[PDB]
């Protein structure tokens, strides 16, 4: 689940990824 999620997060999702994984 995680490598495809990480790949799409890098591709066009980093705004949601940074808040969810607490890097904002």
Swiss-Prot record:
Tagged with keyword Cytoplasm: no
GO CC term (a single one): extracellular region
Top-level taxon in the UniProt lineage: Eukaryota
Pfam families: Antimicrobial_1
GO biological process per UniProt: defense response to bacterium; defense response to fungus; killing of cells of another organism
Subcellular localization(s) per the UniProt record: Secreted
Predominant location: secreted
Tissue-by-tissue expression: Expressed by the skin glands.
Keywords: Amphibian defense peptide, Antibiotic, Antimicrobial, Cytolysis, Disulfide bond, Fungicide, Hemolysis, Secreted
Disulfide bonds, paired cysteine numbers: 18-24
Family membership: Belongs to the frog skin active peptide (FSAP) family. Brevinin subfamily.
Function, in words: Antibacterial activity against Gram-positive bacterium S.aureus and Gram-negative bacterium E.coli. High antifungal activity against C.albicans and a strong hemolytic activity.
Protein name: Brevinin-1BYa
Source organism: Rana boylii
């Amino acid at each position: 689940f995680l490598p495809i999620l990480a790949s799409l997060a890098a591709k066009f999702g980093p705004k949601l990824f940074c808040l969810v994984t607490k890097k904002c």
